[PDB]
Design a binder for this molecule. Structure first.
Ligand code: 2AN
Ligand code: 2AN
Ligand code: 2AN
Ligand code: 2AN
Ligand code: 2AN
Ligand code: 2AN
Ligand code: 2AN
Ligand code: 2AN
Ligand code: 2AN
Ligand code: 2AN
Ligand code: 2AN
Ligand code: 2AN
Ligand code: 2AN
Ligand code: 2AN
Ligand code: 2AN
Ligand code: 2AN
Ligand code: 2AN
Ligand code: 2AN
Ligand code: 2AN
Ligand code: 2AN
Ligand code: 2AN
Ligand code: 2AN
Ligand code: 2AN
Ligand code: 2AN
Ligand code: 2AN
Ligand code: 2AN
Ligand code: 2AN
Ligand code: 2AN
Ligand code: 2AN
Lengths: 159, 163, 159, 162, 159, 159, 159
């Protein structure tokens, strides 16, 4: 059970409830707001917006990837806590079974602090892509920095 | 030590939809300014005379002229703006009514959902061998809660006001 | 202290996801479509429909009553299980601190079955009689009925 | 309608005894030090819950002839390292019907081969009834005399807790 | 950047509050009781059972490895959760920066459920020895049991 | 022109007033108690023990070195700070006018943390034999460690 | 690891409530005032004009370096005592990690005298180049010399 893991910490001028709404609860929608050139649509197909909720993110028709689904494992918007899981979608490929994210945020001034952890759950006797991992933190970190900048400059959004 | 003069302490537990950073700011840091903005008929101005809006800072809160009162003097004893903590003391001004040595405000807030949780604890300190009026206490808490409640509605209404 | 406990076991032709949506998850917004001659507005004042959510139902201007705020406690919608708190509002008389409903449905063929466990808790400052505890029941029994008629005649709603 | 009162006493103190010493005697081991200093007033004292850390509770018992009989205490916050503690006298016959509980905050600091302390004690009234100086001064003088007693033995014995 | 993670779930017949005191809280001393042949000492350098506790170990002089050092990130003693990291040691080979221990137990019947995660963080540039992984599990597992049975055979131990 | 100052930070189980006394105030007398094969005598030749005080420390006979004189420039015992300086002796070779010593200690639990800064000042138109600094620290640290162990065993010395 | 230390005692007719501000508190805006050709911009991007603040001086298009960042380990704007650290920026050659500047201004009638301790601290095994010290000591003394003029020139400013 060899699972590669990236546990990191970040810090923002953006407020923590706001950033959470943007990067966790509303992520499926916000992905399409920040990258209309990559994602055609983002929805919920199962759940009411809390634990057990299932989203469907669809790439534009010209993108190599097709779609992904994530499920909400635990959510406690009270203390900016959620653990979700990417359990279906081409990006996974054949070597990976599901990618699990666990996010913890907290206010530090008018801004935030967060502990983000990614763990890749490989299929029986497969090699987790070390490269797939660099691509993972890459795609997100950009997204997170891209959102942070919209928000900074549009303070009424999710405020 | 025949006695260590007894002091009067109120411990409050309060909650807002306002995010702890907007409130730490509106009612602690820029309070001096937000009072006059919120209640421009009672206070002409608030202005930091000493320090640079940080620890050991002291402000002068000024009432109108016709108003019984004139100026209030607050000193900043402890701050951790990151964690929304503050000790700030009231010492120079006639709001005491020539009997209280000082009033000790201790404040701690924390985020919840889209809002705040709040630790407030007021302590009234008299000058040598004087009584600590229940009266002033009734009023020290009542004017501030009203104050607080006005500034909440503002910030709920105007959602970009504090940063 | 001690409280009055109404416990029940009702049965319905409507499927349980249709009732759970109509009478638990969207109750607040459904009380106004059905009793627009009583209620002006229903709304979540805070929450993601999760567990710490709070809704607000407002009575019409003339109505002797003014408002109620309900705050979910824990949910399992998939299973149609919900415990939800009536913590404040004009409706609570001085004798009542809160009223706790415990909802759990199951399927019965093309219909449903459900047990309800409504509890009136008082304030130390007063005691609980039966006239009021009997009214709550009527209000809420009569509501469902009005809704059953509706979920039966329009099968598209929350199906 | 208003927030209930409670009475606080702030003290600032200075000792020529090293501070880790007095943190052991009047705080971490108050329950055992109280009997050694005052076997005349106390029969025993001891722990009943925990192993010294946050949440730890202790029990105090006065001889069979004393008009008081026992006292309970819970440790709210311990940061021994900087000599800060917050504990609560929450149960025993010492709480005259008006008193609900007594909260004690203590911070100590090094000053040469001795120390400086700031002690704050907060009495909390129970619904309806009111607190008064009675319980307080008596409470103030009991704690102080004990400590002086501590101070004179800790000095008279350099290696004890040193 | 990427770490080797080990997620483990087993479950043992002992009340959580009893394993907890042995396999983690006092795991310094009871590690000798367990192996008075591989283990020389069990010590708590600092921490009064306080989070941020750091222990000190040393195998018998014969053993090639000198000692092991742990800090306790957090301990929910009341809740039977603990996070601890192996931060220094001869056992901590020159290619591993730290090995993190995430353990959470809870009562199940008259037994326990064991899920624990250990993460292997490699010192900058190194791949980390996949040997130290297989090894890590076997050694702290074999010891898992010893301590189970013993505690099983004495119901008065840490009651 | 610029001198060499080595900024150190250390930790002792001993209390700061103990460290400070032993390693600073009666240091001239302890060096002989701890190292009577190295040293013959410690004394004060120009001072009362207050600021601007001078000690005279002779090395046993048949020893390379002959003696050393230090002056106590700043003394704030209350906060455990000191500024003293070696300015005379064959131990200071041809180069360096004066290596300066600055000790700042703090209480912590049953012990103490320290901050020490040695500032080696080159001799008029010279370089600093940065190999005499390597030599200076060692002996001063052993002296220390010997004193540490000595004070721990006998907890009545500098109480 | 050794460090390079500067003991410089200066003088100046110009009043210290102006130099101190210029030379320390508003140095970031004034560097950029005395040498527009060396720097195009300089600002405070963190902290709030007090101990713990961080500055960003931005060298012009035509410079090897483009920016450096300073931190105020300590401020005392009434006794004219400061202690700020150069933590980040290109100027720090692989062998230098930070420079610690301790300044103290005293009042000599209508002017000042001073003591500046500049201490360059090396990274893990690396050592500072004699070069690295005279450079820093000079463009800075030079800067000071232009301001002695600037100010004296016009008592209007900083008075
Ligand atoms: O404004 S929102 O959609 O709320 C929004 C919310 C959060 C992040 C966003 C990033 C980019 C663009 C947005 N809006 C946008 C505006 C114009 C065109 C396309 C997107 C973002
Ligand atoms: O799935 S939904 O599409 O919202 C859905 C649609 C219509 C009625 C539903 C009733 C109960 C639970 C649902 N979902 C749900 C999903 C996950 C967890 C808990 C409840 C219902
Ligand atoms: O550069 S950033 O957006 O800052 C970026 C910031 C921080 C971390 C990053 C990690 C991986 C990839 C990026 N790639 C990337 C790739 C293409 C465009 C933009 C970014 C990261
Ligand atoms: O592009 S960024 O992450 O901004 C980037 C920034 C700085 C250094 C990089 C080194 C390798 C790969 C990158 N990116 C990358 C992006 C996509 C696929 C593969 C590699 C680097
Ligand atoms: O969901 S995110 O990573 O945030 C994401 C953010 C932005 C762009 C993305 C594009 C492709 C795949 C994603 N997910 C993905 C997940 C795991 C592995 C590889 C790609 C993207
Ligand atoms: O950007 S990442 O860490 O890659 C990221 C990856 C996946 C989910 C995330 C959710 C919330 C915030 C993020 N970042 C974040 C950054 C700064 C502060 C707080 C959170 C998330
Ligand atoms: O953010 S950084 O942490 O520096 C960072 C981390 C990792 C990779 C990065 C690649 C490009 C730019 C960065 N910075 C960046 C910063 C803000 C906006 C866009 C890119 C990268
Ligand atoms: O807008 S005001 O009417 O003054 C106002 C009225 C009442 C309460 C206020 C509280 C905070 C900030 C305000 N204004 C504000 C204005 C500019 C900058 C920052 C705050 C408040
Ligand atoms: O409680 S108030 O009386 O308004 C109050 C009185 C005095 C000082 C206060 C400082 C901060 C916040 C307050 N209120 C507060 C309320 C809710 C949450 C957080 C703080 C203060
Ligand atoms: O007196 S208090 O309400 O405490 C009070 C406190 C502080 C400022 C006040 C300003 C105007 C009127 C008040 N009260 C008031 C009282 C009686 C008649 C009319 C007005 C003020
Ligand atoms: O309480 S304050 O928030 O500073 C405050 C807030 C708003 C209005 C006030 C009016 C008068 C006196 C104050 N202080 C005060 C303090 C102690 C006793 C009596 C009045 C007022
Ligand atoms: O009682 S207080 O808690 O102060 C109080 C606090 C906050 C708001 C108040 C509003 C109206 C009356 C109060 N009572 C009141 C009573 C007598 C005179 C004036 C106001 C309010
Ligand atoms: O439609 S209404 O005429 O408002 C309506 C009228 C009367 C009773 C109703 C009961 C349940 C749902 C309704 N409507 C509804 C409509 C859309 C979605 C969910 C419920 C009811
Ligand atoms: O307060 S809300 O207005 O929804 C809100 C608004 C914006 C961002 C939020 C982030 C987390 C939790 C919320 N609310 C929440 C409320 C109750 C329980 C749990 C979370 C957020
Ligand atoms: O029962 S509810 O279902 O919320 C309800 C449903 C429909 C109509 C109602 C009208 C008034 C009060 C309610 N609540 C209420 C609560 C307790 C006692 C009496 C009435 C109503
Ligand atoms: O109002 S009465 O019918 O008189 C009434 C009287 C007595 C008990 C009742 C209980 C539930 C509902 C009522 N009304 C109701 C109305 C329509 C449908 C179902 C029940 C009750
Ligand atoms: O029973 S009622 O009186 O309408 C009622 C009263 C109070 C709370 C209720 C909550 C859910 C469903 C109801 N009715 C229901 C009806 C059929 C099947 C399952 C639930 C509730
Ligand atoms: O706990 S102490 O104060 O340390 C204490 C010290 C020494 C003797 C004491 C005797 C009785 C009661 C105590 N407590 C007490 C508390 C409140 C009121 C009056 C007495 C005594
Ligand atoms: O203040 S006393 O009332 O005796 C006292 C009362 C209750 C607890 C105390 C704990 C530590 C030290 C005290 N005195 C102290 C004195 C001098 C220096 C340091 C501490 C304590
Ligand atoms: O005699 S003691 O028993 O200590 C004593 C105990 C309790 C209260 C005291 C009050 C005043 C003076 C005392 N003596 C005193 C002695 C030295 C310094 C300060 C006060 C008190
Ligand atoms: O550390 S290991 O490298 O796996 C290891 C290697 C060899 C023997 C071991 C014996 C006991 C515990 C281990 N680990 C361990 C870890 C934490 C607490 C207690 C024991 C042993
Ligand atoms: O060693 S092996 O049998 O290879 C082994 C193989 C697979 C899993 C193991 C787990 C724990 C201990 C082992 N050995 C062990 C051996 C002797 C005493 C205690 C534990 C394990
Ligand atoms: O540092 S001391 O602690 O005095 C020291 C203590 C004990 C023995 C010493 C022997 C030689 C040189 C020293 N110092 C020295 C100092 C500067 C340069 C070269 C040597 C000795
Ligand atoms: O020590 S200097 O190298 O000049 C120096 C270098 C860099 C920054 C300085 C800031 C204030 C004073 C200095 N000294 C000083 C001395 C005499 C007159 C004016 C300034 C500074
Ligand atoms: O003349 S300087 O004052 O340095 C100077 C100041 C401002 C901008 C400069 C741009 C290029 C070269 C310089 N000279 C230079 C000289 C030697 C090495 C590197 C650059 C610049
Ligand atoms: O010329 S500077 O522009 O500082 C300069 C810039 C960059 C690198 C330099 C290297 C050596 C000497 C310099 N200057 C120098 C100046 C006077 C005397 C001796 C050396 C360097
Ligand atoms: O650049 S040079 O003079 O060559 C120079 C060379 C070598 C060392 C220097 C030290 C300080 C200032 C310089 N220049 C300087 C220039 C004008 C006024 C004050 C000092 C130094
Ligand atoms: O910041 S100052 O020295 O005052 C300074 C003042 C004026 C111009 C400077 C140009 C380059 C580098 C500096 N500093 C520097 C410092 C340490 C090492 C290397 C360069 C300059
Ligand atoms: O730069 S000047 O052109 O004089 C200048 C022009 C306009 C406004 C100024 C304000 C402050 C300091 C200056 N100069 C300054 C110059 C050197 C050192 C310190 C301050 C100002």
């Amino acid at each position: 059970m060899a699972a590669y893991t990236i546990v990191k910490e970040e810090e923002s001028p953006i407020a923590p409830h706001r950033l959470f709404k943007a990067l966790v609860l509303e992520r499926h929608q916000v992905l399409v707001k920040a990258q209309p050139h990559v994602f055609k649509s983002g929805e919920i197909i199962e759940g009411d917006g809390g634990v057990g909720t299932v989203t469907k993110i669809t790439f534009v028709d010209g993108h190599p990837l097709t779609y992904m689904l994530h499920k909400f494992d635990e959510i406690d918007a009270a203390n900016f806590y959620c653990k979700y899981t990417l359990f279906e979608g081409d990006v996974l490929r054949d070597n990976i079974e599901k990618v699990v994210y666990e996010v913890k945020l907290e206010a530090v001034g008018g801004g935030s602090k967060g502990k983000i952890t990614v763990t890749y759950h490989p299929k029986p006797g497969c090699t987790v892509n070390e490269e797939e991992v660099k691509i993972g933190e890459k795609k997100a970190y950009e997204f997170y920095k891209q959102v942070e900048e919209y928000l900074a400059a549009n303070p009424e959004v999710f405020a």
